[PDB]
Design an enzyme around this catalytic site. Sequence first.
Site, PDB file in Angstrom:
ATOM      1  N   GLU A  12       5.334   8.041  -3.151  1.00 36.91           N
ATOM      2  CA  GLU A  12       5.934   7.171  -2.177  1.00 36.91           C
ATOM      3  C   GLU A  12       6.977   6.442  -2.312  1.00 36.91           C
ATOM      4  OE1 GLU A  12       1.827   7.982  -0.648  1.00 36.91           O
ATOM      5  OE2 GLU A  12       2.586   5.711   0.256  1.00 36.91           O
ATOM      6  N   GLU A  54       0.762  -1.234  -0.232  1.00 36.32           N
ATOM      7  CA  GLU A  54       0.115  -0.019   0.099  1.00 36.32           C
ATOM      8  C   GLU A  54       0.552   1.964  -0.053  1.00 36.32           C
ATOM      9  OE1 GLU A  54      -2.920   0.315   3.458  1.00 36.32           O
ATOM     10  OE2 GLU A  54      -3.396   1.840   2.815  1.00 36.32           O
TER      11      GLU A  54
END
Lengths: 318, 318, 307, 303
Positions: free
Chosen positions: A125, A116
């Site tokens: 990210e 995730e």
Amino acid sequence: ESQTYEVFEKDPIKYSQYQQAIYKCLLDRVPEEEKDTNVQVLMVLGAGRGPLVNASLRAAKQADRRIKLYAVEKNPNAVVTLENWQFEEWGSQVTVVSSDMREWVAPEKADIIVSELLGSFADNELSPECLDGAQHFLKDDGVSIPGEYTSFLAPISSSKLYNEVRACREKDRDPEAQFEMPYVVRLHNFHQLSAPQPCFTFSHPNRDPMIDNNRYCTLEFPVEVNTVLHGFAGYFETVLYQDITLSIRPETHSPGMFSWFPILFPIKQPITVREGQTICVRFWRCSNSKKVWYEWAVTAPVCSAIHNPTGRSYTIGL
Amino acid sequence: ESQTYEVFEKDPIKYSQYQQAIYKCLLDRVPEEEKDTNVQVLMVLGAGRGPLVNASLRAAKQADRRIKLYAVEKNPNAVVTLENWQFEEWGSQVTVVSSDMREWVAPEKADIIVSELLGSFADNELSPECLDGAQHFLKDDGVSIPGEYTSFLAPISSSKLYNEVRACREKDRDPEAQFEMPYVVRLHNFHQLSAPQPCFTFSHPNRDPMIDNNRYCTLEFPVEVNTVLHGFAGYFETVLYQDITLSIRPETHSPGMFSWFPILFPIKQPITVREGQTICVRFWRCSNSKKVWYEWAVTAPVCSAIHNPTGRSYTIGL
Amino acid sequence: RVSSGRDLNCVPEIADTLGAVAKQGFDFLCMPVFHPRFKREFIQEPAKNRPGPQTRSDLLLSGRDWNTLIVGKLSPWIRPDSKVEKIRRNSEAAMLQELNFGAYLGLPAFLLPLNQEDNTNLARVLTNHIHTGHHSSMFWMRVPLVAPEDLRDDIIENAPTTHTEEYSGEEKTWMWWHNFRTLCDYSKRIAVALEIGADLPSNHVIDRWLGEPIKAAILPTSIFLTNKKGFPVLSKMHQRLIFRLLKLEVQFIITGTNHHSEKEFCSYLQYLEYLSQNRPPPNAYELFAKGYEDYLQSPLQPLMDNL
Amino acid sequence: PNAPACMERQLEAARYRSDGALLLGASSLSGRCWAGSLWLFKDPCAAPNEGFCSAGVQTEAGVADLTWVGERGILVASDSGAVELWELDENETLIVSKFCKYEHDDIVSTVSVLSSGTQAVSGSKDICIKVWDLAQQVVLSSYRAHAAQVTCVAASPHKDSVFLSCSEDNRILLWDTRCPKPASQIGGYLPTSLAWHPQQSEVFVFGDENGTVSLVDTKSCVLSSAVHSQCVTGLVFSPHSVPFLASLSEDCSLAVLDSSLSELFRSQAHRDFVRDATWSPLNHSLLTTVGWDHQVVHHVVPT
Ligand SMILES: N=C(N)Nc1ncc(CN2C(=O)c3ccccc3[C@H]2C(=O)NCc2ccc(F)cc2)s1
Ligand SMILES: N=C(N)Nc1ncc(CN2C(=O)c3ccccc3[C@H]2C(=O)NCc2ccc(F)cc2)s1
Ligand SMILES: CSC[C@H]1O[C@@H](n2cnc3c(N)ncnc32)[C@H](O)[C@@H]1O
Ligand SMILES: CSC[C@H]1O[C@@H](n2cnc3c(N)ncnc32)[C@H](O)[C@@H]1O
């Protein structure tokens, strides 16, 4: 922080899709005759406070298949939560690992890896870099969830948002640093000038020799109105397994989910755009051994400056 | 740059000491009866344009011993010089390696490693980290040149230098960033308030389990005059092998050598010091996975602010 | 009188080449840093692991020679804005390499070509290089008055040259420059090396380059006419241009082979000298002003201040 | 052997002649001196050893491209901007310079000899294409047709006035000097290499930068195949009646193709860029390649 993980966990739609995604993958890999012979090795890479771990348990139960869970997490504050859960609830089925996935030397190879590591622009990210580093301890026929994700861009006109970014000037840095960095924002008072187009895509596991996560994308946006370009709204789609997906792209937006807001890539100066003209934007994904960052520039109908060269204004830490 | 290496090479005193240092080590490791049986594996870690390589050749010839040279160098611009030299002059005895010493997978272990990774404050080039990373491909009875180096500090009074540092204020950064970073400078118009004392020391090869290069040193400088403290002059000594040394400490300064100038660690505010009082300075060597940096603070006779916390103003790149 | 240099794309011996160039009376030499045809791989094996030295050693010249007499050139095979992803990535790594080596040598200037419309990725790489280190080396962008496509011979059967007057289309090479320098955000390190063609464009196309940072003015040998004596000269059209360029005080570079094989190569330079001496001399205004060209000063306030 | 002490690393060209003597061009693209050289090997298997060569000579500048001018003559494309012609002596030991005309304003990249044998066409980075006469040693014509660097030129085998050319401007010009407007543009990725078909005067093949080898008829509809992973450097047909096409590239491989561009042979022998190929006229099944890795590999093609 704790309350940052709390609000992540307060979206049941996301994890239900993760639950369903794993559920399906278990049935595909493990047949009915090998129900209680085969135990699938799952590895949650970035477990947080362990919603994916819980989801992986639920998915195994509804599927009625045996699983062996690891729970890799680098943040040591979250690991405290995991171990307290693990001691009380999960047990020895879940093995909490307090490490970076890029570093961790695995004692066993995984059939599935679940992650995730996606932001509002998917790859902001550094999910590519992390899952690339954790690719070695995947089986040669191993699955990744998500298996794919793509980022989208769309030009916008917002004299509000432009003026908002403008007011983010801080002491002791470049006067126009604020324009050379993305923002997560619930876009409201704005005008989308053209339909979103895909920018960057990533597939896991990546099999391309010498896996390079640097990219350069040219997009051309047909505008059908007079307007003033102030920035580019960013969205993303992700394929968890097959037909199970998550998305914040307006036209294919997952209903109910409120996990990710859109991202905004501003520009220093507004750009006039006449009806009929095409907005041409360029986007780079750049990296070195320490940092990853985006650069961007408008090339039509007029040229803007290249924004965030060498990640001077904004970097993403490896 | 080329001309930065040029001026390094324009100091014959330094390399003559390196030559002599290797010369002695060859005679110690290799006896007279094993003159043409044993070939010592030397490895210049950070070869530059190859003065140490040349010195290693001279040292072997005067000693009359056989050597096998590697020339590790990460800077690819310098490697061009090395390979042109190697093709024309050296030959297959010298193996030019274009790599980082921390990364390079060695095909052979070294009897000696030679390095020139020292600055004006010895360890401000991260010689510790580099040689620690290159320690694996040293033999268990292997030597390092240099084998040891120490840094020294001494409090100074210079209303000139203080006012000089003051004028290094730049746009788009902290107003007092200039005070939280060291400077290489030929100290001239200044007053040394106390005799230099050792700050940080490093020994190679480091055998201490879990080798930590972080440090914290407290020094007390007896002052015998009224004055105003403006900063701390930094020097260093290095043991190449045994009695062969290099030094820029005024009282033990190598005669003729002009390779390193002293370093200066300023302070934000000048500090009054009465005769009889002791100047008490504190120095930290701090690091993470990306950066290494110094912090410092005066504690007596009055407290200064801690300078360069978290390397906000100055870092040294790994 | 006039500052001049020599453009070569072939240097068999760097020491010998300078000697010849210097003897002819040139001030500096524009030359490659890597061999133009020496194409290099950075990704795919086994070509990436090519052994041996990549180029010449810096020791062949003195530090001062590099700093004053040499001007770098990007290799021609380097195409950062290629449609092929492999050629792009390779050209990026190659461009950085050559630029970094340029800085290593400490070259005062380095030539990069603008020979097409889209030079976006080129700009992006250069801008990155500029924002790495504290080098003060200039970057001369090689850009022609008239694009190669627009000055080609009308000798293709099924593709005739545009015989239409395109006012905007004839100013395309300026738009090449304008976009590049805008992307790079008006870097003071980036300047123009204007390459002069055989046929000069319309007057407006030349006026376009007024108020632009022209540092160099590249003159091919092919544009030179021959006089009755049998030595190189220029047209009255080109003479007026050179007269304009001398006011800006640019450095004239000579490129191409010796078409006037009978005479020396100095003749070309001697003609620029001939032009330099033969100009209208500076009046009282331009004599005293010589020094303050485009120098910003605050307006005097004799009321508020005491002069 | 009355020749230079050592040849250069980067072998650029390799050609066989009638009897089967292997010509070799080589350039120094690295180090102190950037020069070229020409060599001859009456023993093909002795290459590239300098001690066992029939002839050899050091040129002023690097060798970009060369080709046979029959038996004695050797025409060179120099970096200086000169097209050089050398001629073997009667003993065929020395190599004396015939002419060396500086006409191109930039590196001469490609050169090819026309049907007559008294003429040749060159291509340069200065964007020009020049027609030469080898007898009078002068440039007959000069053509600025392309808008970019001329990559490859190829003379029609059986037609003196006809030749192909390709450039980075993404044009493949078919020429005919008899016409007032000689060039004729044949209608994505840039063309790099050209090769006329030996038995058909209206057919040719071209390789691109992307690695696709194509098959073109001058009349019409084209066939192609993704042979290499990188730029196709050169294309050479075999001396067979039904010819095989050898393709070389910067991916460090060799592939022999049939009539329908189907892969017959594969050879990952070279470690560096494969620069040229030449079929042995004695033994048609043999094929000699040269590269920048300084190898001279002889391949046995299964025919
Ligand atoms: N989920 C992972 N593993 N990673 C992730 N990376 C990035 C994510 C998305 N977000 C941000 O980048 C962000 C930044 C500041 C504040 C909040 C966010 C967050 C966000 O857009 N949340 C929406 C929201 C906010 C407030 C609210 F009351 C309800 C919903 S999620
Ligand atoms: N030698 C290695 N391997 N590493 C090294 N790291 C650091 C070194 C020491 N120096 C610097 O930190 C420095 C910074 C700027 C300018 C110059 C220097 C240099 C220095 O103090 N040189 C003295 C000098 C300067 C000028 C002159 F005309 C004569 C002598 S030497
Ligand atoms: C649930 S939000 C994503 C989680 O992944 C974790 N994470 C991100 N990168 C890594 C990594 N390389 N190794 C381990 N955990 C990671 C973060 O700390 C966060 O808790
Ligand atoms: C002669 S000055 C010191 C030299 O050591 C080189 N150097 C510094 N650190 C390393 C390293 N980790 N690996 C290889 N060379 C290095 C520098 O590039 C410089 O040329």
